[PDB]
Write a protein that holds these residues in place. Structure first.
Motif, mmCIF file in Angstrom:
data_model
loop_
_atom_site.group_PDB
_atom_site.id
_atom_site.type_symbol
_atom_site.label_atom_id
_atom_site.label_comp_id
_atom_site.label_asym_id
_atom_site.label_seq_id
_atom_site.Cartn_x
_atom_site.Cartn_y
_atom_site.Cartn_z
ATOM 1 N N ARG A 36 -4.082 7.441 5.648
ATOM 2 C CA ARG A 36 -5.458 7.922 5.739
ATOM 3 C C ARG A 36 -6.143 7.404 6.999
ATOM 4 N NH1 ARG A 36 -7.746 9.994 0.911
ATOM 5 N NH2 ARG A 36 -6.300 9.853 -0.857
ATOM 6 N N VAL A 37 -6.844 8.303 7.691
ATOM 7 C CA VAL A 37 -7.612 7.967 8.881
ATOM 8 C C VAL A 37 -9.047 8.436 8.682
ATOM 9 C CG1 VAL A 37 -5.585 8.132 10.379
ATOM 10 C CG2 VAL A 37 -7.105 10.102 10.118
ATOM 11 N N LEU A 38 -9.926 7.974 9.565
ATOM 12 C CA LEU A 38 -11.326 8.365 9.518
ATOM 13 C C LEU A 38 -11.519 9.762 10.095
ATOM 14 C CD1 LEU A 38 -13.035 5.028 10.643
ATOM 15 C CD2 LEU A 38 -12.738 5.896 8.320
ATOM 16 N N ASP A 81 -2.202 6.209 1.385
ATOM 17 C CA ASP A 81 -3.322 5.322 1.683
ATOM 18 C C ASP A 81 -3.156 4.651 3.041
ATOM 19 O OD1 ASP A 81 -4.525 6.008 -0.653
ATOM 20 O OD2 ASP A 81 -4.341 4.045 -1.615
ATOM 21 N N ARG A 113 -8.638 0.804 -1.697
ATOM 22 C CA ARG A 113 -7.384 1.124 -1.019
ATOM 23 C C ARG A 113 -7.443 2.462 -0.292
ATOM 24 N NH1 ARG A 113 -3.413 -2.370 -3.369
ATOM 25 N NH2 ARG A 113 -1.648 -0.974 -2.954
ATOM 26 N N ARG A 114 -8.259 3.399 -0.773
ATOM 27 C CA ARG A 114 -8.353 4.702 -0.128
ATOM 28 C C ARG A 114 -9.281 4.713 1.079
ATOM 29 N NH1 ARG A 114 -9.361 9.118 -3.014
ATOM 30 N NH2 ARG A 114 -10.242 10.110 -1.151
ATOM 31 N N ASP A 115 -9.991 3.620 1.354
ATOM 32 C CA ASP A 115 -10.997 3.621 2.403
ATOM 33 C C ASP A 115 -10.390 2.961 3.631
ATOM 34 O OD1 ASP A 115 -13.239 3.245 4.141
ATOM 35 O OD2 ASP A 115 -14.544 2.622 2.519
ATOM 36 N N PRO A 116 -10.209 3.685 4.744
ATOM 37 C CA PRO A 116 -9.593 3.076 5.934
ATOM 38 C C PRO A 116 -10.437 2.001 6.597
ATOM 39 C CG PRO A 116 -9.440 5.473 5.987
ATOM 40 C CD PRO A 116 -10.425 5.129 4.920
ATOM 41 N N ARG A 117 -11.737 1.935 6.315
ATOM 42 C CA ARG A 117 -12.570 0.895 6.905
ATOM 43 C C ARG A 117 -12.358 -0.464 6.255
ATOM 44 N NH1 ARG A 117 -16.203 5.336 6.903
ATOM 45 N NH2 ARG A 117 -16.838 5.929 9.019
ATOM 46 N N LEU A 137 0.823 -1.204 0.000
ATOM 47 C CA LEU A 137 0.000 0.000 0.000
ATOM 48 C C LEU A 137 0.859 1.257 0.000
ATOM 49 C CD1 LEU A 137 -3.079 -0.375 2.411
ATOM 50 C CD2 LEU A 137 -3.098 0.400 0.045
#
Lengths: 8, 31, 202, 101, 105, 203
Positions: free
Chosen positions: B10-12, B7, C142-146, B3
């Motif tokens: 990235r966090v929520l 990417d 890949r861009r989604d942390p969930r 990755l």
RNA sequence: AAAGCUCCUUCGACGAGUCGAGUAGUUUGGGAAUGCUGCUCAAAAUGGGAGGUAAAUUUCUUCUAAAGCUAAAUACCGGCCA
RNA sequence: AGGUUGACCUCGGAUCAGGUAGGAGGACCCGCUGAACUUAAGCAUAUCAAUAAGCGGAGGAAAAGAAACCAACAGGGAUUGCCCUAGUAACGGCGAGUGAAGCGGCAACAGCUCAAAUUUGAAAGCUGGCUUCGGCCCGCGUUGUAAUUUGGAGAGGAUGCUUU
């Protein structure tokens, strides 16, 4: 009426 | 295939708010 | 929302409406291939609660597996050692038909990652499952942390190693006194209990 | 809470402490019935109807064979308590049908 | 494009120091989305419900006439989820609802 | 009783790496302390009492402070793990004494805590001022905030004027009586209900 | 614009061929109390699981399954360096 | 023009644009499958052994993991490992034998994300293509992509200060 939650 | 750095970093939104308002602090304890 | 109603309706599997829908869908899935792609989940509430999202990178594959026990591949179905006082008609596979379904779907789509799977129908010969798969190479994934935890190489073929829900169920990974032998791994626990430990100052 | 006796044995045994009253933990609210869940389950029951074994137990309860209904529901469901609870549920359904008719 | 123009007008209103409600008017649209429409029916805000006749899986709408009957909502089954999608700028809509319209309608 | 009937030589574990593993653990602890300086190397732990009747005489360090303890000490639950306080949401306070002891422990820690500002040129009201930021500090919360009295004192002196009178009838007789009522609690209730029913029938 | 603390009338959705039961095989110290799998039956709403002797009745104590992620302390007859 | 013109749904084609999988290694790890020699006088329960061989799948560790736990105490509090518990509770033809766990001390510590809610005064979300690098398009998606909530709570109110 049926409500899921209190709303603003 | 690993990755990308962005990417993986990235966090929520909830995590970002929590880290903004309560980060790990610099502290010391008196003896 | 509607998914609460779908949940409460899916609980009532012996009702007339659900029974009719199961009958016609069993016929259709029997006429289709053993492994085929579903364009959309036939149980959207179940798929959503197991983690499916309507996003590019999530696919659904429908699969049927033959049900019943397991037969040992011996010639003429008979053994050549000490008597076992049983036949091959009563040998039980230690994994589930659900696990076999996920494994075959993963072999069909080796480029994806199995997320989870769910029962959709059954008859006398087959049990029918739907498998949710995620594309680890899709940028929206890949861009989604969930979900981008599944792009890591430690999650290659989770269904082959028992890291899905049915795999954990079959491995017995639960807390409690009922799972003393299996909660940390049965073979690892056996090795720990059968290891002879010798210290320097004994 | 009942104060302990400060003894090693007997009734209400144990070391004496000032027991506290706790605000109930939200994890212990499971099982409590909600208004929306009531409405949704009632609507789904009305839409879908009954199972064949439920119809058999309802027929037995209308015929008044309560012991046979409990035995049949135990055979169908597996446990005595679940069989009993299903019996009062179907009796309530029969009572609602009779008060409607 | 209409949303972009409205957001541009609201941005100019904020720049000149006015509220966005001073430049924008309350909208009246056809309500859609299955969860949204079910919530509106449960809150008894929907005035009319139109349900597509060809929803697959059918369980997504099989309770909805009974829900409308319980809440006293006028409903109608209509031909074409694609036809409702043409209303809501989509390929497919399972259900649409009217809650309120303008005074001339 | 020797258990050597399996292939035991396949999984014999020796421990020649005990000093090397001690060296590795010490190097890891030194690296962790250097990375965490000037914070302590560990988190503040509450004082809890061991379960079962065998070990309930002794106290020890627990996992973390309860939410009730943090609320009564005035430390928010999001701030607490960022200033060296371990938090345990599973534990509850069933009695006042452990709650009060842990609250006093938290108050002592908060009184001895020095909090540096997030930005040095913009100090806040909750942050420690620079003229008080310098002091002799500690780097081991397990040592500075250990369990000082794990057990109750085993010896105390009183005058003979205040010797207690004792349980009437004797301690041994009291224990035998308590066991007797504990065994007969159901029989007395059953006979009481039977006598009440008979009195109601023939009143 | 977001975020925390304090108090509260009220509301407070919580995972189904799943849990559980019977049977069969296998497994376990759990051949009265174990886990897994196959077939049949198949749930509930202060409900459900557990509380290592079967059952009914009345209580009590603990958690909250059937979705998911996560470093460290641990293993190492393979590879590389020492 | 309506015997026409289209919208969807499902299923296909393409050396279509861009990607991915296979094999090796396998000491350690996660599963499946699975013996016999041996030890029981012999020997179909048993033991060797839930092992060897066989098969599938990862990494620098893996796995497990933040309780549908342990307990019954004045209660502990995710997981892993060492010491002890303990050759103990318990299981076992005609007996050879087998055999954990809670607590306790220590090493190391770290917590969290969804589904079930209407944003409904505005799909606020995202892949890809072309860019003059401002953005513009083809689309995905309402059979639900963002923000908010996860039981330790939360949602709605009240309230006055703090924080970036």
């Amino acid at each position: 009426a049926v409500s899921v939650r209190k709303r603003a | 295939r690993r990755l990308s750095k962005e990417d993986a970093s990235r966090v929520l939104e909830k995590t970002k708010k929590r880290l903004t308002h309560f980060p790990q602090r610099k502290y010391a304890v008196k003896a | 929302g509607a998914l609460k109603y779908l949940e409460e309706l899916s609980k009532k599997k012996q009702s007339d409406v659900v029974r009719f829908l199961l009958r016609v869908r069993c016929w259709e899935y029997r006429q289709l291939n053993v492994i085929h792609r579903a364009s959309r989940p036939s149980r959207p509430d179940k798929a959503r609660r197991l983690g499916y999202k309507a996003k590019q990178g999530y696919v659904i594959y429908r699969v049927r597996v033959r049900r019943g026990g397991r037969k040992r591949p011996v010639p003429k179905g008979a053994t050549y050692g000490k008597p076992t006082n049983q036949g091959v008609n009563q040998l039980k596979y230690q994994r589930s038909l659900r696990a076999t379904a996920e494994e075959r779907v993963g072999r069909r789509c080796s480029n994806l990652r199995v997320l989870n799977s769910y029962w959709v129908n059954q008859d006398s010969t087959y049990k029918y499952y739907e498998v949710i798969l995620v594309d680890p190479n899709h940028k929206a994934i890949r861009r989604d942390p969930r979900i981008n935890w599944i792009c890591n190489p430690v999650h290659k073929h989770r269904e082959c190693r028992g890291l899905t829900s049915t795999g954990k169920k079959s491995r017995g990974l639960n807390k409690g006194h009922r799972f003393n032998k299996t909660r940390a791994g049965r073979r690892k626990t056996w090795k720990r209990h059968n290891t002879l430990s010798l210290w320097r100052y004994r | 809470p009942v104060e302990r006796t400060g003894l090693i044995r007997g009734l209400n045994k144990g070391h004496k402490t000032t027991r506290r009253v706790l605000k109930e933990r939200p994890s212990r609210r499971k099982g409590a019935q909600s208004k929306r869940t009531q409405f949704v389950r009632s609507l789904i029951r009305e839409v879908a109807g009954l199972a064949p074994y439920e119809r058999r137990v309802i027929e037995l309860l209308r015929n008044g064979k309560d012991k046979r209904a409990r035995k049949f529901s135990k055979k169908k469901l597996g446990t005595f308590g679940r069989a009993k609870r299903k019996c009062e549920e179907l009796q309530r359904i029969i009572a609602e049908s009779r008060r409607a008719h | 494009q209409e949303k972009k123009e409205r957001l541009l007008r609201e941005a100019t209103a904020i720049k000149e120091g006015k509220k966005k409600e001073d430049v924008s008017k309350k909208p009246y649209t056809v309500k859609y989305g299955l969860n949204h429409v079910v919530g509106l029916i449960e809150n008894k805000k929907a005035s009319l419900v139109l349900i597509a006749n060809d929803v697959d899986p059918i369980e997504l709408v099989v309770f909805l006439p009974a829900l409308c009957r319980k809440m006293g909502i006028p409903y109608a089954i209509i031909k074409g989820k694609a036809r409702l999608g043409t209303l809501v700028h989509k390929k497919t809509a399972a259900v649409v609802a009217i809650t309120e319209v303008r005074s001339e309608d | 009783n020797n258990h050597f009937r399996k292939h035991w030589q396949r999984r014999v574990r020796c421990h020649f790496d005990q000093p090397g593993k001690k060296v590795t653990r010490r190097l890891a602890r030194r690296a962790k302390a250097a990375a965490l300086a000037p914070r302590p190397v560990d988190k503040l732990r509450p004082i809890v009492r061991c379960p079962t009747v065998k070990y309930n005489r002794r106290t020890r360090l627990g996992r973390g402070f309860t939410l009730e303890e943090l609320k009564a000490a005035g430390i928010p639950r999001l701030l607490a793990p960022t200033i060296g306080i371990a938090v345990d949401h599973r534990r509850k306070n069933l009695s006042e004494e452990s709650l009060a002891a842990n609250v006093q422990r938290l108050k002592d820690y908060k009184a001895r805590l020095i909090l540096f500002p997030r930005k040095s040129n913009k100090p806040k009201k909750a942050d420690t001022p620079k003229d008080q930021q310098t002091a002799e500090t500690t780097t081991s919360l397990r040592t500075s905030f250990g369990v000082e009295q794990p057990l109750a004192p085993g010896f105390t002196e009183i005058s003979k004027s205040e010797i207690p009178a004792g349980i009437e009838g004797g301690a041994y007789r009291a224990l035998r009586k308590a066991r007797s009522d504990a065994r007969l609690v159901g029989v007395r209730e059953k006979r009481a209900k039977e006598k009440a029913e008979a009195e109601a029938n023939k009143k």
